[PDB]
Structures are given as structure tokens and as C-alpha cells.
């Protein structure tokens, strides 16, 4: 015949193992750019000497050789930059062929065809398709990450930890990233095919998928619903009718599947750690090494001056006033790549944030921002550095406002409080790794103030005597939903005179971002104090008082505004978090791959009332497929539930089982169990 191809062997399993893509649950050939793969191609005869083959690869709807979304390359003896195919051996009619892409190739799905020149004729045959990802193993790839252990954490690990809580009590939730789970890589690639950029100009978008800066910024937009019907619809209202309480999610898997299967319609509802977990999945799936960051006391600066305003009334109510805010924490991501746009001192970790806060070039997106650049205060560099710098290091101004007079006055400036205990999961363990010193110079240093002035640069008060009165709120005993709250306010008089202190106190339930929900308690007190006398004032809030307005955040904001005659107010502030009841998971046998293992959940109702509508949701990559739901019967007061269920480990290694227990009185109780799966 004319020379024609009979069959192709992609040697998928071998190539996937060599390309570090073997973990994805998928049949497809998944490869990493800049790295060869070997195929065997069986022809109808041996190659004639007036015969030639060309490979053609293309990605996207408008492939172009000049944009590098199409390449045409001969089967040669040599590699010549770009894409190449080397005939490694002929044996009969079988060709052993090593194909390789350039390190600068666009990521995504590709088609491969073969063009045959034979007997003066030209024929073309589609060979197959493959997925090409970024290559953090390859020294010349922009996403290169040289350390083995760190690549394992930041690319290959599908279970993680996100720090939450407050500066008074840092806690953690597990998160199932689940980048290897069925359809997740495919869904993450679909994200790119649905952005506003792709819809506007697919040819340019696809060509730009060689750039982790670009893919990273696209994902920061597309993970939020705003503008583009992307993945997650945000809600910080405390009312989650029509969707899941943001705290009930345990991973990215069901979110991404629910988006796709609904016809790419937003999933309801997310808060910041939910956006971050989901963005983390997408980054790791596409091969940008990434991790999740939590910033405590995180500032939302809306007017680009690196200062945020918080307001109280003289009766000690927090006020919702001014666009700016301070969150108990905010979660975002870092991606690992060089910054060809900024230069060599600014590569490494880059902030990316899918939480819709500020528009950037018209669109709710954020980053990439060099972490190094933020610490040095080079806030003129792309992208979104003013906003990010304020999040970790705004100054905070406390104001009194009295709407009866219309007067506002400045109480205090606090230049140390924003940006604390910036945290990420340690490599290879669940320890908390503090990265504040990467984002800022130390609080209290000359450097920190110098950098603040520099940053400010790029984008009358009378100081009174030191207050006579100092105060602080302290917790007495346990904080637990169902139990009363006991606090002490401690005041001390440092002046030389006796002082009479008038104290106005409130407690407000809040969302973790500072959204005020409802007042649940308020008192006033008057305390006469001798020079140097310290005194206490007990504060008691019953279950009945908070039960109706406490949200899944379990947060109460307590405030004491203290005043003596002829001195400015002192504001004493404490946010508390109440513990959920204990929820435990245990495995009753050792976990071995492919063998069922019985798990046990224990939960005790601490209330004197029954709990109803009890649901256990469980998931964990490598331990079960998808999300198990178990209806649990109504629990009488002080009664315990014991629920047993099987799981079926599918991979060996250290895996993470997550559970959410929800009922009418306790939304979103969380449990996590590390499970060692043996071969």
C-alpha cells in the first residue's frame, strides 16, 4: 500500500508514572510539558526512503503555529527546540518514538494527528488526544519547584488543613482537595474554557495558558460566581436559605462536581476558606504548586490608604459604618512560580485570592502578587498589591460615633493588630507553619514602619495623657454552645487620683468577617478605683440569650466602653468562639487497600432538649468515592449516638477522613481522622 498507520500504543501507564500524573483517576493520557513521552506506532510496512511522517498537535478552537497552539514536526533523528519526535528504533513495521513538547507549551487538552507523505501523496489521520499540564519537576519550567518533599506537599497531596478561629484560639479544619478524584482534573480544565477571557477571544486565551501568572489570575476569577457564573456563590449574611451553610462543606470535590453537573451554575454557598480550598484544588490539578494561607485580623481596605476604620457608639455597640472592615481571619492561596514580568527577586510564592472582595480590571479577581514584593512594600507591581498589603498590614483606627449629636471622634490607632499568625499547613504533617515573617517585617521594628511609609508613598488630633484606666476582658471557664458564657472585665487605675469609671458593655453575635447579626446582652456598671486598684466585673450570658442569634461561626463580640471624667473613652474588645459538642470518628480495624474498614462516629447531645434533622456527611480521597450521607435519628436530651459505616480504601498512604454533623441546634460540627492505609 501507500505507507499508512495501523495502530498506536500510547504506553499510558508508563508515561503517566514518568510524568508524575499517575494518581489522577482517569483513563486519559496525562502528561507534563517540556518532558518526552514514548509511543509505539505500527505501520502497514517499513518506511520507504521517499517517505516521511509529520506529527501535528493542536489545542483549543483556533490553533495557530505562531501562537504555539499548533505544532507541525517531522519524525526525525533530532530534537530541534519546540515540539519534536525522535525515531528511537524500527523493528519490522513498528516505530519506537519519543515525542516532546516545549517547556513553554500552553497547558490543556491536545489532539495529535499524523500526516504521511508517500508515493507523491499526502494523507492525514487523527491519532488521539492527551492532556498537558505544568511541570514542577522540570528545572526550566516557570513553575519548577526543586525540593522533592515540598513538591509532594504542594502538588501531590490531596488532603489538607486550613487554620481558622481567631488570634485568641487558632483552630483547624480538614479539607479534601481531591484533585485526583473522578472528573476533577477535567472540570478544572473546563474552568479555563468558560472564563470571560475564553468567551471573548478563545485564541488569545488558549495561547496564554502557557503562563502560570495568567492561569492563576483566571482561576482567581472563575472560582467565584461573580461576573462569569463561576464555581462558588459567596454569602456572609448568616442566612443560607437555598443552599449549604458555608461551614458544612468538607472539600472541593462536591463543589466542583455540583458546578459542572448543574450546567456550570454557581454552587451555594461559600466563604473564604471554601473559595481557597477550591482554588487550591484547581492549582494543584493543573500543576501549579500551591498552598492555603490564613491571615488573622485581616483588613479590607476599600479606599487604598492602608488604614481601616472601626466604629463604636458610647454605649459599647459595634457599628456597621464605613466600607472598610476587619475579619477575624481571611483565607487565600499562594502559587509557586517565577515572575518574568517583575524579575528574578520576585519569584516564588504568589498570592492568589478567589474570594470576591475588590474588582481588579473590572472583575472580581486577585493576584498574582509577589509575597516577597509585599513584604518589601513594592505595591506598584502587578497584581493587586495595595489590597493585599492592607490585608496583612493595614493600620486600624478606632472611632467613637454618637448619631444623636452626629459627632465622630478618633479613639486610637493600632499599627500592630492587623495581620497576625499567618498560617499554612506544614510539609508532611498537620503542624501549623507561621509565615507572618514572609509577609511583613516584625511588628515593633523600625523596618516595619519604614516599609509602611514606603507603601503608603506609592499609592488635627491632640495626643492626650496616657489613660488612667486600662482594661481587658478574660474568659472564665468553658465556652461551649449550650453553656452560659462567663467573662470578667478587669480594670486598673494607673493615675494618682481616685477615679470613677463608667462602663457600657454589649455582646453581639457576628459572622467571622465582622458582620453584625444581633445584640444578645448588654449591661452598664460604675466602678470607683483607688490609685493602683484593679477590680473585676463579671459578665454572664445565658444559653437562652444567645441561642437564637448565634450563627455557625459560634462567635460573640463583647465590648466594654469605659470612661472617666475629662479623659477619652477606653474600648476593651474581645471576640469569643464557643466550642461545638464533641464529634469523633474512629476506625475499628487497620485500614488496608481494597478491604472494607468499619468506622464509628460518636456524638453526645449536651442539651436538655432533643436534636433533630441529624445528618452525617463523610468524605476523604482514597477512603471513599464521593460523599456519604447518613440520616441519624432524633437524639433525646443528653443522649449519645453511635453510627457505624464501612469505607473502602483505594490508595495506600496517610489519608484523611472528614465528617460534618448537622442538626437543628448545631450546624456544621466537624471531625477529622488521619487514617494510615496499608498495602
Amino acid at each position, epitope marked *: 500500500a501507500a505507507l499508512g498507520v495501523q495502530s498506536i500504543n500510547w504506553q499510558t501507564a508508563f508515561n503517566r508514572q514518568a510524568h508524575h500524573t499517575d494518581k489522577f483517576s482517569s483513563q486519559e493520557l496525562i502528561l507534563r510539558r517540556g518532558q518526552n513521552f514514548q509511543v509505539l506506532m505500527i505501520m502497514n510496512k517499513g518506511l520507504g526512503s521517499n517517505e516521511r511522517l509529520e506529527f501535528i498537535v493542536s489545542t483549543g478552537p483556533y490553533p495557530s503555529e505562531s501562537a504555539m497552539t499548533k505544532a507541525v514536526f517531522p519524525l526525525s533523528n533530532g530534537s530541534s527546540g519546540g515540539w519534536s519526535a525522535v525515531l528511537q528504533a524500527s523493528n519490522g513495521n513498528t516505530l519506537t518514538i519519543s515525542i516532546s513538547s516545549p517547556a513553554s507549551a500552553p497547558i490543556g487538552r491536545y489532539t495529535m494527528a499524523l500526516q504521511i507523505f508517500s508515493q507523491g501523496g499526502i494523507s492525514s489521520v487523527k491519532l488521539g488526544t492527551f492532556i498537558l499540564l505544568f511541570n514542577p519537576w522540570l528545572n526550566v519550567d516557570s513553575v519548577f519547584m526543586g525540593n522533592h518533599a515540598e513538591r509532594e506537599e504542594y502538588v501531590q497531596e490531596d488532603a489538607g488543613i486550613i487554620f481558622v478561629g481567631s488570634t485568641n484560639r487558632i483552630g483547624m479544619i480538614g479539607w479534601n482537595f481531591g484533585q485526583f478524584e473522578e472528573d476533577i482534573l477535567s472540570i478544572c480544565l473546563s474552568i479555563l474554557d468558560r472564563s470571560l477571557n475564553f468567551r471573548r477571544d478563545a485564541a488569545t486565551d488558549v495561547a496564554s495558558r502557557n503562563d502560570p501568572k495568567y492561569v492563576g489570575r483566571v482561576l482567581s476569577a472563575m472560582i467565584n460566581s461573580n461576573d462569569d457564573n463561576g464555581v462558588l456563590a459567596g454569602n456572609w449574611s448568616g442566612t443560607y*436559605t437555598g*443552599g449549604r451553610d458555608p461551614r458544612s462543606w468538607n472539600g472541593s470535590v462536591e463543589i466542583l462536581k455540583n458546578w459542572k453537573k448543574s450546567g456550570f451554575s454557581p454552587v451555594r454557598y461559600g466563604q473564604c476558606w471554601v473559595f481557597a480550598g477550591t482554588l487550591n484544588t484547581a492549582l494543584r490539578s493543573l500543576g501549579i504548586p500551591s498552598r492555603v494561607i490564613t491571615n488573622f485580623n485581616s483588613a479590607h481596605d476599600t479606599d487604598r490608604n492602608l488604614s481601616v476604620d472601626v466604629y463604636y457608639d458610647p454605649m459599647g455597640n459595634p457599628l456597621d459604618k464605613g466600607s472598610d472592615s476587619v475579619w477575624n481571619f481571611h483565607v487565600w492561596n499562594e502559587g509557586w512560580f517565577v515572575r518574568s514580568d517583575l524579575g528574578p527577586s520576585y519569584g516564588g510564592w504568589q498570592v492568589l485570592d478567589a474570594t470576591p472582595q475588590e474588582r481588579s480590571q473590572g472583575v472580581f479577581q486577585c493576584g498574582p502578587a509577589s509575597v516577597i514584593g509585599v513584604r518589601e512594600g513594592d505595591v506598584q507591581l502587578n497584581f493587586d498589591m495595595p489590597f493585599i498589603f492592607a490585608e496583612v498590614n493595614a493600620d486600624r483606627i478606632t472611632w467613637l460615633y454618637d448619631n444623636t449629636t452626629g459627632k465622630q471622634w478618633k479613639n486610637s490607632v493600632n499599627s500592630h493588630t492587623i495581620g497576625r499568625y499567618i498560617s499554612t499547613k506544614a510539609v508532611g504533617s498537620n503542624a501549623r507553619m507561621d509565615v507572618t515573617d514572609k509577609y511583613k517585617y516584625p511588628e515593633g521594628s523600625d523596618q516595619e514602619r519604614q516599609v509602611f511609609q514606603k507603601a503608603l508613598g506609592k499609592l488635627l488630633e491632640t495626643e492626650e495623657q496616657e489613660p488612667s484606666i486600662i482594661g481587658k476582658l478574660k474568659v472564665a471557664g468553658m465556652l461551649a454552645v449550650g453553656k452560659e458564657v462567663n467573662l470578667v472585665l478587669l480594670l486598673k487605675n494607673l493615675s494618682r487620683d481616685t477615679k470613677t469609671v463608667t462602663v457600657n458593655m454589649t455582646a453581639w453575635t457576628i459572622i467571622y468577617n465582622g458582620t453584625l447579626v444581633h445584640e444578645v446582652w448588654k449591661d452598664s456598671a460604675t466602678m470607683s478605683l483607688d490609685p493602683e486598684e484593679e477590680a473585676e466585673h463579671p459578665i454572664k450570658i445565658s444559653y437562652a440569650q444567645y441561642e437564637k442569634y448565634l450563627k455557625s461561626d459560634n462567635m460573640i463580640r463583647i465590648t466594654a466602653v469605659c470612661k472617666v471624667p475629662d479623659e477619652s473613652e477606653v474600648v476593651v474588645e474581645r471576640d469569643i468562639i464557643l466550642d461545638n459538642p464533641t464529634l469523633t470518628l474512629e476506625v475499628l480495624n487497620e485500614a488496608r487497600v481494597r478491604k472494607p474498614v468499619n468506622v464509628q462516629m460518636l456524638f453526645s447531645n449536651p442539651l436538655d432538649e432533643p436534636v433533630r434533622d441529624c445528618v452525617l456527611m463523610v468524605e476523604g480521597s482514597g477512603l471513599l468515592l464521593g460523599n456519604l450521607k447518613i440520616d441519624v435519628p432524633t437524639l433525646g436530651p443528653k443522649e449519645g449516638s453511635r453510627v457505624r459505616f464501612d469505607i473502602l480504601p483505594s490508595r495506600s498512604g496517610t489519608k484523611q477522613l472528614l465528617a460534618d454533623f448537622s442538626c437543628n441546634k448545631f450546624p456544621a460540627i466537624k471531625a477529622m481522622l488521619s487514617i494510615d492505609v496499608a498495602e
Partner: antibody
Amino acid sequence: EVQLVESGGGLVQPGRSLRLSCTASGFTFDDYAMHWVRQAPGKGLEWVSRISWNSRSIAYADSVKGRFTISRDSAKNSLYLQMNSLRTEDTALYYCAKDHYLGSDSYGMDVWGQGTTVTVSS
Amino acid sequence: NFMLTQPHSVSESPGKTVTISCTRSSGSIDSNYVQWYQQRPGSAPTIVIHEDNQRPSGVPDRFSGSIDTSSNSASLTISGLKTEDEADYYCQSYDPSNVVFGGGTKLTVLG
């Protein structure tokens, strides 16, 4: 447990109107889309209509579009189907169904009522 | 829009495994979730599979669902058949508007 109770079914003449009602209990009504599905005696299930959790998105089977109107009422935890211009072919058992999905626009019927019978004949 | 096509009937003996297919006429079967329902005579349908392959509370682990991209079909598979499994079964999916049911399959457990 979820309970859905349909009512309003009966014998009625081609061209007249009938209103079905479904009362829902044992779940948060406003969290979920709701559906009507019908089944002619000894035949298959035919979806009729869906209404979204917030009533802002509604869909109809082609076979009923223009003639039937779905609606719901939060305070009464109830779903309705106004059926006008009936036809002998509309004869069926009419089931009320709660959607499975919470927080996404996918559709499935986790709980069904026992249905209310509609016979259309002159 | 699309249709879902199921076999009119299937049958197998007690203790064996049987499979009911559900083929989508256009668009990909994996674009949208598939549910399965059982219906006994005189009774409303009950859900046996949701979200392609998840099992509700109370459904025996003998019931499983799958998706096969190559045939553009979903399948309900029942192992260890018992006489009580004799019933009608329906598949269901949707697009962003409309809900689509399969035409139903009578499963006979051969007696």
C-alpha cells in the same frame, strides 16, 4: 421524615380548570426546588414542572406549557399546579416531589407524595 | 433536549446480578447527574441512586449505579437479586431546564 400530601384531584371536563395543592413538612421547604410529575395508569413517569427554591426559575414540559402554572407559598409550606385547558391526555396520577439537591441547580426527586388522581373526560 | 432510552424489560434468577441501561440520545451522559427510582404497583416511586452512583440512607449495598461515557449510558446494577427486587425501575437526568425520565424497565426475578 419528609411528608408531601397532594390534593385537589378529581373528574373534570376537557377545557375546564383544576388546581392541585401539595403540603410539605419535615424539611426546610424554602431550601429546595419542587416538582410535579405525573403518571397515566399503567404508563411511565412524565415530568410536568419545576419551581426553584426562591421561585425565580420555573420550567414546564412542552406538553403542558402555556396551560399549566406552578407556584409555591413559603408561609404555608405548599406547592401548587393550576391546570387550565385540560385534555383527556392529562389524565394521570399527579405526584408532588421534593428535589434532592441543596445549593445547586441539578434536579432529582428524593421524596414523592402518594399523588392525587386527575381524570379528564366529557 | 434529549431522551433517555432503557430496555423494556430485563430478568434474572434469584441470587444473580442484573443490569438496566439508560442511554442518553444527545449530549454527554456525564454532563448531568443521573438518578434511579424503584416503583412497585400501587406505590409512588422511591429513589435508589442519586448523583450517578451514590446510595440513599436505607438502600441496600446490592444496588449500585454507574456511568459509561463510551456508550453514553448510565446503569443500575442489582447483585444478589431477591424476589422483592421485582419492580419497575426508571432512570432520570436533566439539562438546565427540563427533567427527563427514561421510559422504565420491568425487572422480573425469574420464578
